[PDB]
Design an enzyme around this catalytic site. Structure first.
Site, PDB file in Angstrom:
ATOM      1  N   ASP B 245       0.833  -1.194   0.000  1.00  0.00           N
ATOM      2  CA  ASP B 245       0.000   0.000   0.000  1.00  0.00           C
ATOM      3  C   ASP B 245       0.870   1.247   0.000  1.00  0.00           C
ATOM      4  OD1 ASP B 245      -2.650   1.410   0.342  1.00  0.00           O
ATOM      5  OD2 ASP B 245      -1.693   2.009   2.222  1.00  0.00           O
ATOM      6  N   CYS B 302      -8.498  11.298   3.123  1.00  0.00           N
ATOM      7  CA  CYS B 302      -7.482  11.741   2.180  1.00  0.00           C
ATOM      8  C   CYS B 302      -7.673  13.215   1.849  1.00  0.00           C
ATOM      9  CB  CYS B 302      -7.535  10.902   0.903  1.00  0.00           C
ATOM     10  SG  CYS B 302      -6.160  11.177  -0.232  1.00  0.00           S
TER      11      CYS B 302
HETATM   12  N1  LIG Z   1      -3.714   9.953   1.005  1.00  0.00           N
HETATM   13  C1  LIG Z   1      -4.273   9.298   2.025  1.00  0.00           C
HETATM   14  N2  LIG Z   1      -5.095   8.277   1.778  1.00  0.00           N
HETATM   15  C2  LIG Z   1      -5.576   7.716   2.899  1.00  0.00           C
HETATM   16  C3  LIG Z   1      -5.313   8.080   4.236  1.00  0.00           C
HETATM   17  N3  LIG Z   1      -6.002   7.254   5.105  1.00  0.00           N
HETATM   18  C4  LIG Z   1      -6.666   6.409   4.293  1.00  0.00           C
HETATM   19  N4  LIG Z   1      -6.441   6.647   2.960  1.00  0.00           N
HETATM   20  C5  LIG Z   1      -7.003   5.920   1.806  1.00  0.00           C
HETATM   21  O1  LIG Z   1      -8.412   5.950   1.891  1.00  0.00           O
HETATM   22  C6  LIG Z   1      -8.933   4.598   1.941  1.00  0.00           C
HETATM   23  C7  LIG Z   1     -10.178   4.560   2.792  1.00  0.00           C
HETATM   24  O2  LIG Z   1     -11.154   5.475   2.319  1.00  0.00           O
HETATM   25  P1  LIG Z   1     -12.586   5.577   3.008  1.00  0.00           P
HETATM   26  O3  LIG Z   1     -13.204   4.206   2.853  1.00  0.00           O
HETATM   27  O4  LIG Z   1     -12.273   5.908   4.452  1.00  0.00           O
HETATM   28  O5  LIG Z   1     -13.289   6.715   2.297  1.00  0.00           O
HETATM   29  C8  LIG Z   1      -7.758   3.769   2.435  1.00  0.00           C
HETATM   30  O6  LIG Z   1      -7.874   2.396   2.110  1.00  0.00           O
HETATM   31  C9  LIG Z   1      -6.568   4.454   1.775  1.00  0.00           C
HETATM   32  O7  LIG Z   1      -6.447   4.051   0.419  1.00  0.00           O
HETATM   33  C10 LIG Z   1      -4.424   9.187   4.470  1.00  0.00           C
HETATM   34  O8  LIG Z   1      -4.077   9.652   5.555  1.00  0.00           O
HETATM   35  N5  LIG Z   1      -3.955   9.731   3.288  1.00  0.00           N
END
Ligand SMILES: Nc1nc2c(ncn2[C@@H]2O[C@H](COP(=O)(O)O)[C@@H](O)[C@H]2O)c(=O)[nH]1
Ligand SMILES: Nc1nc2c(ncn2[C@@H]2O[C@H](COP(=O)(O)OP(=O)(O)OP(=O)(O)O)[C@@H](O)[C@H]2O)c(=O)[nH]1
Ligand SMILES: Nc1nc2c(ncn2[C@@H]2O[C@H](COP(=O)(O)OP(=O)(O)OP(=O)(O)O)[C@@H](O)[C@H]2O)c(=O)[nH]1
Ligand SMILES: Nc1nc2c(ncn2[C@@H]2O[C@H](COP(=O)(O)OP(=O)(O)OP(=O)(O)O)[C@@H](O)[C@H]2O)c(=O)[nH]1
Ligand SMILES: Nc1nc2c(ncn2[C@@H]2O[C@H](COP(=O)(O)O)[C@@H](O)[C@H]2O)c(=O)[nH]1
Ligand SMILES: Nc1nc2c(ncn2[C@@H]2O[C@H](COP(=O)(O)O)[C@@H](O)[C@H]2O)c(=O)[nH]1
Lengths: 474, 474, 474
Positions: B245, B302
């Protein structure tokens, strides 16, 4: 600039309507990216402070020049004030920042009001030129507003001679109660201060300097009156770059002003604006302007779009003007509409050599405006537009013209509650731009422009992700 | 994927911009749909829990594995902790869930704090390994926080030997005051609990199991340091699937890491991300990755889109990457941007074999974060991003890099006031996906991808219908 | 007690209706006042903690005994619990207070909940009996509630061997980040802690000790069941003073109970109550009670006045009962109605040897109740009355009597936001009493009673002056 296949919208695009598609990247670290511009402005970061009296200040000039950007002094500023600002800025240390100096005979109210003019959070008490103590908002609370500084000075602080590397200074401030280190001259006098984060920024940012090694500073000229004489006076004042600024840059008076200034062989880069069309950019360049400012309407203080209907989405204007300029070997500056670091990144990917930032930096300690607190004690600074100062020029006549000039739009720019300094905003912008370059795969801004692949999104596309915290954006 | 005639927008699409057009269907019942994936991950439902320390927990690992999904342990987690988590998860019963066990010598405050770590709502009091009573928030109210569990245990509860079918267990809990049935081992010791809804879920969901029949669990590796050694250690720890990742998967360091991990002949499916382009997907697959994670920006935590301008609407990225991957026989995972079950359904219709869900599952009892209550007593859990853990890698140096890393974005994920467990969220997601399959007319996810017809809508199109209730979505 | 000329009201007076008239004084300093009582209770300050389960706690017993007061253990408390409390209290150091001890294997939630059981604000981490670090609410914030203490312990703290004078301990804590000094035994084990203010209080307050030098502690008996056996058991448990407590002390059952207890030749001071009449006081004294508790109705948790109309303004009851008791050589205790230190001062000037304080001390860290926070995050503790425990004594029969017993009145006792400990309340009360003695001109409480001149005021008279700040009063 290359777009995704099929991404040919029937409308002009803002920064909100576009996104950067990541590509194959060999740039792993963000520090591997060279942010230096190639437009001749000499800025080592793509950030330029707009020529607005609410933002383009003396302290902001020094700070932004030290961090690698440049500040365009607002037009119609008195030549004496411009000369004083240039003399102060060009005498500043490349690494050590100027603190707020207080004599022991100063008042507590004066110390408190002067304390917020810098991002250090502490003011140096100097007697006979030698530091005595640090004045802090903590020790100014509950004290009579007209007591002397002697009663509030804190006798302890970290000292280090000027020229000490940022490593030891950062080490010295490891457990200091105040995050300010008082740099001293070899004879013991005060030479400035080095904040714990200031040492890191000095290690990261390369100051924008002229041929003589002094901090760069720019000045602006209107097209009213004798533009040539004003440009000559600003050049002799020490300005390293001249900006011919008008609300409508694609007009005959602007071409005449550019021809007059460029005919003096002043030996400085020439910036003219604003236009949002390829024809305007080419006309400005052929008139003699090396750099063409881009943007009519996206300015946060600009009411042209709502009052006149005239304008253009900033991203499309920047891409068109950058293509036109680099077709003729010129450069463009993205002016206005910058709220987030993504705006700077997209403007650079759009072809702009530099990005001009206005009201966003008004909500900083270094802004010339006075720090204000609302009913919730949240710090803010008032940002106001240039208004008639960007336009084309007996009390009856004054009121007659004044009846039609655009009003001075005022907005509340809240300071970041913890990172209210402009250095923090520069950190956010530069980190975002470096992240964009790493995602694209470019080690420098020209490579960012050539190698970028862009796409178009709807409102839901912009709504994706986490919004930036308060204070990080405008 | 087939689109409606004339639905060729000049922009990239999110999940909000697309809809599924119903087709001729022979699938009448939602239970006729097979939700098993074909990417080699072994999940019987298309739900994968993201490798974030705020969501990817030990209890969540057990619960999601029992319900058919898989949980990717966050990267940079200590190898001892990973080994302990794998040993615990793979020792869990396929049908009976692990309750919160309290000794009679425990405190009431400890019981109350531990009570919300599971969705049962009751904690089993065990003495010498045998159940004694149930601790419930009802009997913990008004009791001294440091009284012993003996004073709050409820002597009545429903018992059934382990191995009893869900039919009788559901029948036994018909009128029980507590909806928890304490399953006992043949020797009388505690074997776990079977919630009234847990029996139905066991009858509906098939657990994701490895070759030995134990619950599946995945682990993540960063591309910093020796990636091969970390992958080897995680494989020996018992991980059934490895995820490489990174925030920017289309970079040279990622290709080197994939080549290093794939050269060990580890015998596990390889997941790499994230990319949003066909070129990145093909490069990752050719490097040795069987599965390519998709999505840069749509993550709820993100800030890349707002900070850098880099990103892509998730639906278009997923369709492009899925086409590229299945052109080479690979698979893709939709990562980020999942707020509603419609996001999962559209990602599956877009060609994704599995859908990765992050901050949405953070607002669940099984999330590793501690349950918190706001001023309105509404339960919530803090969700935070991976931040530097997803990036590419003396206190001065630490602060120097830390000055440019993306900040840890924090958000409030409110729990469902009645259905706060992650099993309820899985129920909503799986029911929505099964409804999508029935509407399309597909009995399985591959048939859902081939047989789906999609359209494009405006904001008013998305505004149609009834919004889902609070707690049902992120 | 002498009143001002013409101050003969036609009604009974509360503490609000009376004031102390200053007289000629030779006592210049407040430290010149001897606050020791002469009723045989052995308290060096006139403060007695009421026998209520919401206030009369083990930690409060230790703290109040160390500061010179006494704590009456609530009646009907199990003899095992009373014996344990007496054994713990009498084993406490006269100068060094017992801290909150945490093992490194304890949880963060347990540490946070246990942290507020003392006024120190820090908890000592001990391994193998030796201090390791200090747990503070500052380092417990943002940490997982079930992490181990190892991850939150602060390795720095001030150490001093047990027996060091308060002067050096106060000097050592001059610039310590934590105001707690960890006192160590000569073999290195933990002996307790000495707060910076605790050193001053040790220098000021003389602990109330028995013949063997251990901290004094009292216990209460109801008049239900065999009172003689309960009194014998409490005497053998180590109680230094016995209180026979009933809502209506002027009744035949009370006289029988006093005769039964006094016939055992137990060798301890006998306290009986409550009465508000001279006849009741004389009857209680002739029955065998050395001390007569005074007050029926003024208790903050007492609803007798509103429910029954029975009561008496506390000041008039105390003056009458004190006159009756000292006519026979006995003493009285002012019970209930104490909101401000002026209440204690007026009760002492009224002739009471000791003043019993109840719900006021419930809003302290040392109170047995659990610390609670309201919607505004203001700390508070619930105070509740004795109810049937102060009254005269098959589920049908239990409900039949329970239908007529007075309900358990509950009130919110907000803690002082900065001085929430009971030691601060004791400081306020003792400073007020010493100021009253200096104003009167008395060096001791008996001289305060003989030399006091009192007056009567209206509501406007009480309204004069500045109200005490929040937390300083009930
Ligand atoms: N750039 C970035 N991507 C993140 C971070 N934390 C999670 N992600 C991404 O967001 C995904 C989860 O998105 P969610 O399901 O919370 O909308 C994770 O699997 C990873 O790919 C972060 O601090 N920075
Ligand atoms: N004692 C003292 N006075 C100061 C200091 N800095 C500024 N002042 C005074 O405050 C006035 C306004 O300060 P600034 O706002 O920094 O000066 P400026 O030239 O207007 O600069 P900008 O607002 O940044 O354009 C100056 O003209 C001085 O009289 C300082 O460090 N110490
Ligand atoms: N008495 C008791 N303690 C428990 C129980 N579950 C957890 N604990 C304790 O609480 C700590 C934290 O629990 P968890 O959060 O479930 O453990 P974890 O390994 O961090 O798991 P995740 O947060 O799901 O990743 C454990 O290390 C134990 O010390 C239980 O059922 N009974
Ligand atoms: N680890 C640890 N546990 C403690 C400590 N003090 C108390 N406890 C635990 O918490 C329980 C309640 O504490 P307290 O309320 O002080 O005990 P108590 O005997 O009820 O005393 P009062 O409430 O003052 O009457 C005790 O029975 C212990 O199990 C301490 O310093 N460390
Ligand atoms: N028309 C107009 N433009 C203004 C005014 N003030 C600033 N601007 C423009 O807006 C730019 C700054 O935009 P900002 O960065 O504040 O959004 C300036 O550099 C200038 O081009 C004003 O009063 N009127
Ligand atoms: N009638 C009655 N008196 C009570 C009760 N609880 C406490 N008291 C009385 O009130 C006194 C404490 O009064 P306080 O100091 O709280 O105002 C106790 O010592 C006791 O005499 C109760 O429930 N009923």
């Amino acid at each position: 600039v290359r777009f995704l296949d099929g991404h040919t919208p029937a409308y002009d695009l803002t920064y909100n309507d576009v996104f950067v598609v990541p590509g194959r990247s060999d740039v792993a670290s963000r520090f591997d990216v060279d942010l230096s511009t190639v437009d001749g402005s000499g800025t080592t970061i793509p950030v330029v402070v707009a020529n607005m009296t609410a933002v383009a200040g003396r302290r902001m000039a020094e700070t932004v020049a030290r961090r690698g950007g440049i500040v365009v002094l607002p037009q119609d500023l008195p030549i004496t004030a411009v000369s004083e600002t240039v003399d102060f800025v060009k005498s500043r240390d490349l690494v050590v920042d100027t603190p707020v100096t207080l004599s022991p005979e100063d008042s507590v109210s004066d110390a408190n009001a002067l304390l917020h003019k810098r991002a250090h959070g502490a003011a140096v008490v100097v007697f006979e030129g030698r530091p005595i103590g640090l004045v802090t908002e903590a020790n100014c609370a509950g004290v009579d507003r007209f007591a002397r500084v002697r009663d509030i000075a804190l006798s302890d602080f970290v000292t280090a001679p000027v020229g000490t590397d940022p490593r030891e200074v950062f080490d010295l401030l490891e457990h200091a109660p105040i995050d300010v280190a008082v740099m001293t001259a070899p004879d013991g006098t005060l030479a400035g201060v080095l904040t714990r984060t200031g040492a890191i920024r000095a290690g990261i940012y390369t100051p924008a300097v002229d041929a003589k090694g002094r901090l760069r500073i720019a000045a602006a000229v209107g097209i009213n009156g004798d533009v040539g004489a004003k440009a000559q006076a600003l050049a002799e004042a020490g300005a390293d770059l001249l900006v011919i600024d008008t609300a409508h840059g694609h007009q005959a008076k602007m071409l005449d002003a550019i021809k007059a200034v460029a005919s003096l062989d002043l030996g400085l880069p020439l910036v003219a604006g604003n236009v949002v069309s390829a024809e305007g950019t080419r006309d400005l360049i052929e008139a003699g302007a090396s750099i063409v400012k881009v943007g009519v309407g996206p300015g946060a203080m600009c009411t042209t779009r709502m009052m006149t209907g005239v304008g253009r989405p900033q991203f499309s204007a920047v891409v068109e003007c950058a293509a036109a300029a680099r077709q003729l070997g010129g450069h463009v500056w993205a002016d206005g509409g910058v709220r987030h670091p993504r705006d700077v990144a997209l403007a650079l990917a759009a072809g702009a050599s530099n990005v001009m930032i206005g009201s966003w930096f008004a909500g900083t300690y270094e802004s010339p405006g006075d720090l204000l607190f609302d009913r919730d004690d949240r710090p803010y600074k008032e940002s106001y537009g240039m208004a008639s100062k960007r336009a084309v020029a007996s009390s009856f006549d004054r009121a007659r013209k004044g009846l039609f000039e655009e009003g001075i739009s005022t907005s509340r720019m809240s300071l970041d509650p913890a990172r209210g300094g402009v250095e923090d905003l520069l950190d956010h912008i530069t980190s975002g731009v470096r992240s964009t370059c790493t995602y694209v795969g470019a080690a420098n801004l020209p490579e960012l422009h050539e190698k970028v692949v862009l796409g178009v999104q709807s409102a839901a596309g912009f709504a994706e992700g986490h919004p930036l915290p308060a204070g990080w954006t405008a």
